[PDB]
Design an enzyme around this catalytic site. Structure first.
Site, PDB file in Angstrom:
ATOM      1  N   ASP A  94      -2.767  -7.714  10.585  1.00  0.00           N
ATOM      2  CA  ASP A  94      -2.928  -8.506   9.348  1.00  0.00           C
ATOM      3  C   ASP A  94      -2.487  -9.965   9.353  1.00  0.00           C
ATOM      4  O   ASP A  94      -2.574 -10.602   8.310  1.00  0.00           O
ATOM      5  CB  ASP A  94      -2.794  -7.670   8.085  1.00  0.00           C
ATOM      6  CG  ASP A  94      -3.338  -8.367   6.856  1.00  0.00           C
ATOM      7  OD1 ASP A  94      -4.181  -9.238   7.003  1.00  0.00           O
ATOM      8  OD2 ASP A  94      -2.907  -8.035   5.782  1.00  0.00           O
ATOM      9  N   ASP A 118       6.209  -6.856   8.528  1.00  0.00           N
ATOM     10  CA  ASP A 118       5.210  -5.767   8.420  1.00  0.00           C
ATOM     11  C   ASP A 118       4.268  -5.745   9.618  1.00  0.00           C
ATOM     12  O   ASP A 118       3.093  -5.665   9.404  1.00  0.00           O
ATOM     13  CB  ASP A 118       4.417  -5.935   7.136  1.00  0.00           C
ATOM     14  CG  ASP A 118       5.270  -5.857   5.903  1.00  0.00           C
ATOM     15  OD1 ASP A 118       6.364  -5.419   6.031  1.00  0.00           O
ATOM     16  OD2 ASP A 118       4.816  -6.244   4.863  1.00  0.00           O
ATOM     17  N   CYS A 139       0.839  -1.195   0.000  1.00  0.00           N
ATOM     18  CA  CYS A 139       0.000   0.000   0.000  1.00  0.00           C
ATOM     19  C   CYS A 139       0.875   1.247   0.000  1.00  0.00           C
ATOM     20  O   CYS A 139       0.620   2.201  -0.733  1.00  0.00           O
ATOM     21  CB  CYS A 139      -0.935   0.000   1.198  1.00  0.00           C
ATOM     22  N   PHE A 140       1.911   1.226   0.832  1.00  0.00           N
ATOM     23  CA  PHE A 140       2.931   2.263   0.807  1.00  0.00           C
ATOM     24  C   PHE A 140       4.309   1.615   0.724  1.00  0.00           C
ATOM     25  O   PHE A 140       4.609   0.666   1.450  1.00  0.00           O
ATOM     26  CB  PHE A 140       2.825   3.173   2.039  1.00  0.00           C
ATOM     27  CG  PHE A 140       3.312   2.539   3.314  1.00  0.00           C
ATOM     28  CD1 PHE A 140       2.477   1.725   4.062  1.00  0.00           C
ATOM     29  CD2 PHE A 140       4.602   2.768   3.770  1.00  0.00           C
ATOM     30  CE1 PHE A 140       2.921   1.145   5.235  1.00  0.00           C
ATOM     31  CE2 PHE A 140       5.052   2.188   4.941  1.00  0.00           C
ATOM     32  CZ  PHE A 140       4.210   1.377   5.674  1.00  0.00           C
ATOM     33  N   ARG A 166       1.212 -14.877   4.424  1.00  0.00           N
ATOM     34  CA  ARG A 166       1.864 -14.008   3.429  1.00  0.00           C
ATOM     35  C   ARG A 166       2.698 -12.941   4.127  1.00  0.00           C
ATOM     36  O   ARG A 166       3.568 -12.413   3.501  1.00  0.00           O
ATOM     37  CB  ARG A 166       0.815 -13.455   2.473  1.00  0.00           C
ATOM     38  CG  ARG A 166       0.142 -12.188   2.955  1.00  0.00           C
ATOM     39  CD  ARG A 166       0.316 -11.204   1.848  1.00  0.00           C
ATOM     40  NE  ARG A 166       1.310 -10.227   2.200  1.00  0.00           N
ATOM     41  CZ  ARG A 166       1.749  -9.308   1.371  1.00  0.00           C
ATOM     42  NH1 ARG A 166       1.666  -9.503   0.078  1.00  0.00           N
ATOM     43  NH2 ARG A 166       2.255  -8.183   1.834  1.00  0.00           N
ATOM     44  N   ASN A 167       2.441 -12.707   5.404  1.00  0.00           N
ATOM     45  CA  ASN A 167       3.199 -11.723   6.203  1.00  0.00           C
ATOM     46  C   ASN A 167       4.207 -12.455   7.085  1.00  0.00           C
ATOM     47  O   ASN A 167       4.719 -11.864   7.992  1.00  0.00           O
ATOM     48  CB  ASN A 167       2.271 -10.739   6.900  1.00  0.00           C
ATOM     49  CG  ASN A 167       1.703  -9.707   5.957  1.00  0.00           C
ATOM     50  OD1 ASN A 167       2.325  -9.328   4.987  1.00  0.00           O
ATOM     51  ND2 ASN A 167       0.503  -9.263   6.236  1.00  0.00           N
TER      52      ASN A 167
HETATM   53  C1  LIG Z   1      17.120 -11.970   0.673  1.00  0.00           C
HETATM   54  O1  LIG Z   1      18.170 -12.900   0.955  1.00  0.00           O
HETATM   55  C2  LIG Z   1      16.197 -12.556  -0.186  1.00  0.00           C
HETATM   56  C3  LIG Z   1      16.623 -13.384  -1.214  1.00  0.00           C
HETATM   57  C4  LIG Z   1      15.667 -13.950  -2.047  1.00  0.00           C
HETATM   58  C5  LIG Z   1      14.377 -13.688  -1.847  1.00  0.00           C
HETATM   59  C6  LIG Z   1      13.994 -12.888  -0.853  1.00  0.00           C
HETATM   60  N1  LIG Z   1      14.888 -12.326  -0.027  1.00  0.00           N
HETATM   61  C7  LIG Z   1      12.670 -12.826  -0.898  1.00  0.00           C
HETATM   62  C8  LIG Z   1      11.931 -12.104  -0.061  1.00  0.00           C
HETATM   63  O2  LIG Z   1      10.701 -12.176  -0.088  1.00  0.00           O
HETATM   64  N2  LIG Z   1      12.682 -11.330   0.752  1.00  0.00           N
HETATM   65  C9  LIG Z   1      12.180 -10.472   1.651  1.00  0.00           C
HETATM   66  C10 LIG Z   1      10.949  -9.832   1.494  1.00  0.00           C
HETATM   67  C11 LIG Z   1      10.508  -8.936   2.460  1.00  0.00           C
HETATM   68  N3  LIG Z   1       9.339  -8.308   2.377  1.00  0.00           N
HETATM   69  C12 LIG Z   1       8.266  -8.755   1.476  1.00  0.00           C
HETATM   70  C13 LIG Z   1       6.924  -8.673   2.210  1.00  0.00           C
HETATM   71  O3  LIG Z   1       6.687  -9.891   2.922  1.00  0.00           O
HETATM   72  C14 LIG Z   1       5.638  -9.690   3.875  1.00  0.00           C
HETATM   73  C15 LIG Z   1      11.289  -8.650   3.570  1.00  0.00           C
HETATM   74  C16 LIG Z   1      10.834  -7.727   4.564  1.00  0.00           C
HETATM   75  N4  LIG Z   1      10.473  -6.992   5.354  1.00  0.00           N
HETATM   76  C17 LIG Z   1      12.514  -9.283   3.706  1.00  0.00           C
HETATM   77  N5  LIG Z   1      12.940 -10.185   2.722  1.00  0.00           N
HETATM   78  C18 LIG Z   1      12.212 -13.558  -1.907  1.00  0.00           C
HETATM   79  N6  LIG Z   1      13.283 -14.096  -2.492  1.00  0.00           N
HETATM   80  C19 LIG Z   1      13.280 -15.000  -3.665  1.00  0.00           C
HETATM   81  C20 LIG Z   1      12.034 -15.885  -3.677  1.00  0.00           C
HETATM   82  C21 LIG Z   1      12.440 -17.338  -3.427  1.00  0.00           C
END
Ligand SMILES: *C(=O)c1ccc2c(n1)c(C(=O)Nc1cc(NCCOC)c(C#N)cn1)cn2CCC
Length: 300
Positions: free
Chosen positions: A160, A178, A25-26, A164-165
């Site tokens: 939430d 989050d 959202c942001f 997924r979170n």
């Molecule tokens: C980091 O090593 C890394 C490498 C591959 C990744 C990956 N991260 C993610 C991933 O989702 N990383 C991620 C995502 C978020 N936020 C997204 C929202 O989730 C609620 C955060 C935060 N805060 C930290 N890291 C995916 N992938 C590849 C997919 C296999």
């Protein structure tokens, strides 16, 4: 423009932005390489995730991200949450540097690891055996509860909580993401379907959905749905039930059925999290202890 906080401030030139990880959202999340995040090893490389505004950034979007950053600073460090590593606020765009979960969110983690079906030809001694086992599923549920117990002790409400979170690291450690966001609770489109088909309203506690009331016990309700997600291996709650039907069903006291291949112990925990009275739902501390007894019993 923002005040300098030398406790968390990190030189933006020590960041190398990589592939984006998603949007919200942001703000958006971008994978990045960090050098000298540990001040003792200035040239050591590490993989982090960077939160930053989008190009449509309002003053509200900036305010929300700034707000999230300050929440990050106060909550502290725990194994089962996405920890703050540093920030970039001086001479350049606002970066909120957090940990990176290499295996993505919990929902997709489970869906990608569903067991082999009946079509798949028997090749080798383990072609009927999938990546996921019951004790690991319980361990995932346990770690989420421990993380939420920590957040609750820091007086933080997720609002939430869902698969997924929840993020999964390289070593299959659950990390809650989050949790400190401003989620616009006075103006929720209850019919909103996300791009991956999620109906976020299916995670809302009754007092949150009907009365706009959020407590830690409302998060417990969401944890119950999260439990259902885990033991359906990434299944969507209230299968094939549109939002309009969800409204009346919730008013009638309807609850989800016991999913296949799920022991009565954990469905029992699900139903406890879904009790009408928030005070008759287990606390997160009780959830941790309950999930621990089950986990220890299967950990020979
Ligand atoms: C980091 O090593 C890394 C490498 C591959 C990744 C990956 N991260 C993610 C991933 O989702 N990383 C991620 C995502 C978020 N936020 C997204 C929202 O989730 C609620 C955060 C935060 N805060 C930290 N890291 C995916 N992938 C590849 C997919 C296999």
């Amino acid at each position: 423009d923002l005040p300098l906080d030398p406790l968390w401030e990190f030189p933006r030139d020590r960041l190398v932005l990589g592939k984006p990880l998603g949007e919200g959202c942001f703000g958006q999340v971008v994978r990045a390489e960090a050098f000298g995040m540990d001040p003792a090893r200035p040239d050591q490389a590490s993989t982090v995730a960077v939160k930053m505004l989008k190009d449509n950034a309002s003053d509200k979007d900036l305010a929300d991200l700034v707000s999230e950053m300050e929440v990050m600073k106060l909550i502290g460090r725990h194994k089962n949450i996405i920890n703050l590593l540093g920030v970039c606020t001086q001479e350049g765009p606002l970066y909120v540097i957090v940990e990176c979960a290499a295996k993505g969110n919990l929902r997709e983690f489970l869906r990608a690891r569903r067991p082999p079906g009946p079509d798949l030809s028997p090749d080798g001694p383990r072609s009927s055996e999938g990546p996921l086992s019951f004790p690991v599923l319980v361990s995932c549920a346990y770690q989420v509860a421990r993380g939420m117990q920590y957040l609750e002790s820091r007086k933080c409400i997720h609002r939430d909580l869902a698969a997924r979170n929840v993020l999964v690291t390289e070593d299959n450690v659950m990390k809650i993401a989050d949790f400190g966001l401003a989620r616009g609770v006075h103006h929720i489109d209850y019919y909103k379907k996300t791009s991956n088909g999620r109906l976020p309203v299916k995670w809302m506690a009754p007092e949150a959905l009907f009365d706009e009331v959020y407590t830690h016990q409302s998060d417990v309700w969401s944890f119950g749905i999260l439990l259902w997600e885990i033991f359906t291996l990434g299944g969507s709650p209230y299968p094939g039930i549109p939002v309009e039907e969800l409204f009346s069903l919730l008013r009638e006291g309807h609850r989800m059925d016991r999913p296949p291949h799920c022991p009565p112990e954990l469905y029992g925990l699900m139903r406890e999290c879904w009790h009408a009275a928030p005070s008759q739902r287990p606390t997160f501390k009780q959830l941790v202890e309950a999930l621990d007894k089950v986990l220890l019993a299967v950990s020979e």
